[PDB]
Design a protein around this ligand. Structure first.
Ligand code: WIG
Ligand code: WIG
Ligand code: CO
Ligand code: CO
Lengths: 383, 383
């Protein structure tokens, strides 16, 4: 059931912005680890005396990395005279965010028809304003409201590359890396209390609950009208034998924030081969693979969707598989992206629900908790 | 002339410590860009609730990357009960350093015979104490005094891998990268006033001035008894046509700090081939190469040291060449390591002064300023 209750016209995920202490080193690490190209910049070389911002792209996926310069470089400026290309940026907010949370997502940006309208309707419907609508070069409008913790939902609308004031990156500095990642599938937040978080966000967006089918969490997924913008939210389950990973996140992150980004691949096998080649040479590590009992149990569950060779290829790469009543998904999770056990990345590919592919085809893999537990004691018994 | 006036026994450079906002991403970028292996760690997985520290090695070169965790993880601790592996670490100092300077060197560490003695004699001779001597696991002693800006000179002495509380990194996570870098040759500071900086440091170390042979700077080099610990210091020259790069550093760094690290290669041609292959895929960029007039002028200056092919190989890689009355050096400079135009790296190889090779063989390349200017207008005229 999809009531299509969006209070304003939402298009697609537009970009994700990381707040960094040094944007250069994070962007270069991510570029190599994920196979994303350097595509735009806004920094001292483009006249920006306020912040350094570097944009990586792979397909339609856009990762922005931003860090503050010394405030002394821009001490003469006022907001009317700012050289910042992102007017919502604030030195104090950025430094406070990174010292509080470490490396993490500041903004989940979605493209909308009219960012000023989206902002007004959101705030009229309970959203906490973060940055009012600002029109950039009479061409693009940006506005921000609080999502959870210190994460903002950023509205972007275009009258008609990335943002005014950003320059395209020269070919010499722009190596065409590509490991197959194509777009952001969903972005997941961790909060202490799911109920009030859901009520707040569904309250100001009109996003509806996306239907699903003791793992340490309770979850729910908010979705736009065509279910292409997907925002899951988790809360911890306390008292459990194993401590909730949601609680660990909240402790090390100093509260609520973005837990993981799920990146759709057009060929998850190629993506994982390329990423795993680079894990120990600057890229990303992956969670430990499931036991072979898990892959021995895959024939009975998805043997009609994946060949034996394709299942063996999942085993080689540590890929997980789950299935809806309507589709199948392949997924795998990285280890945390930075020092703290907080944000990580999921790589995903979805099989089915063809019409284009409908959003969320196959679900989000919640069945992989019990299957993993089931594989673990089975492999212990086989030993 | 070398008076050998060291006030305590100094051995070699031991390590360089970067203070980071996220040590993981910087260490992974540097590892790939410079061909350094992950060799030790101290972090949550080793019981350290205070800071994340990752050690990269190439030959005898040791780069340490450290960032703070949330203070809440260690709020119950006191210094007697600390889980920090580096007792001088302070959350507030680290956050203040990185917000003030961005990514940069906090500590230049030298190995000494007796770190407590080195500390006492230094402070008795004018050094500003930063962290008193602390004995780690009855095995290693560490102490720190101020060097310039917020950079400390760290004394390490061993009674008898890296530091107690660090664990060696597992083979799977430790890929044996190596592009030929072997040790730290020198570490250079920028200050507003050279005179008082020299008087202070030579005052408490007994380091002597290393003899040399309008570029925007005045410089002098302090050296230990065997001239293997080399600490150059620069001040800006104001009024010049082109603005001093030393002044630009001081402005963007918010004052004095470490300007560049010079890393000796056992084969600078291999090192530069390997680094340049990776510049646009996560590694380091290099300054723009000199005009071919520079290499056309190399035959007359070093044609007795380098063959024509070896000179052509310098041209392919953008390497610079300078010569003493006693030796020749090959050198090249990276672009800044992070967002700000502050710290960069120099790769160097020295030819001559065999006895082992004596320190500073060939000088530091100060002659390359006039040669570069001379190449530039010559190439303009040839056009
Ligand atoms: C649920 C779920 N609900 N919604 C809306 C989602 O998007 C999801 C997921 O993506 C999903 C699905 C299956 C999984 N199976 N195992 N693990 C183990 C683990 C990995 C990294 C850690 F730091 C700690 C534990 C997972 O994390 C896991 C996730 C995170
Ligand atoms: C001097 C000197 N004295 N001592 C004790 C040293 O160690 C040195 C050097 O290493 C040395 C030698 C020759 C050079 N020729 N050209 N450039 C251009 C440039 C590069 C990066 C920038 F951000 C701005 C300008 C240099 O920097 C340069 C250096 C830095
Ligand atoms: Co997910
Ligand atoms: Co130098």
């Amino acid at each position: 059931k999809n009531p299509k209750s969006d209070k304003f016209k939402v298009k697609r995920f537009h970009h994700i912005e990381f707040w960094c202490g040094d944007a250069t080193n994070v962007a270069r690490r991510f570029s190599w680890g994920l196979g994303m190209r350097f595509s735009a910049k806004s920094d001292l070389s483009t006249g920006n005396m306020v912040h350094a911002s570097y944009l990586l792209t792979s397909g339609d996926l856009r990762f922005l990395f931003t860090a503050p310069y010394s405030p002394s470089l821009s001490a003469g400026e006022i907001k009317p005279t700012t050289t910042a290309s992102i007017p919502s940026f604030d030195h104090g907010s950025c430094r406070s965010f990174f010292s509080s949370h470490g490396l993490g997502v500041r903004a989940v940006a979605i493209e909308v028809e009219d960012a000023e309208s989206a902002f007004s309707i959101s705030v009229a419907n309970g959203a906490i304003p973060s940055s009012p609508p600002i029109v950039l070069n009479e061409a693009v409008t940006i506005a921000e409201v609080k999502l959870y913790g210190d994460v903002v939902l950023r509205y972007v609308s275009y009258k008609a590359e990335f943002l005014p004031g950003f320059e395209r990156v020269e070919d010499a500095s722009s190596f065409p890396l590509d490991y197959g990642i194509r777009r952001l599938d969903h972005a997941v937040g961790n909060v202490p209390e799911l109920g009030p978080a859901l009520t707040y966000v569904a309250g100001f967006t009109g996003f509806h609950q996306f239907a699903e089918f003791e793992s340490g969490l309770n979850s729910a997924v908010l979705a736009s009208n065509d279910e292409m913008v997907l925002l899951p939210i988790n809360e911890p389950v306390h008292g459990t034998k194993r401590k909730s990973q949601i609680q660990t996140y909240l402790e090390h992150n100093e509260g609520a924030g973005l837990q993981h980004l799920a990146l759709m691949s057009e060929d998850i096998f190629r993506t994982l081969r390329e990423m795993r080649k680079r894990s120990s040479i600057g890229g990303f590590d992956f969670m430990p693979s499931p036991p072979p009992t898990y892959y021995q149990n895959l024939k009975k569950r998805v043997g009609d969707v994946l060949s034996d060779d394709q299942i063996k290829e999942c085993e080689e790469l540590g890929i997980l598989v789950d299935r809806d009543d309507q589709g199948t998904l392949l997924q795998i999770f990285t280890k945390p992206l930075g020092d703290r056990p907080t944000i990580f990345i999921e790589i995903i590919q979805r099989v089915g629900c063809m019409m284009y592919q409908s959003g969320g085809c196959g679900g989000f893999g919640k069945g992989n908790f019990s299957e993993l537990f089931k594989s673990i004691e089975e492999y212990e018994k086989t030993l």
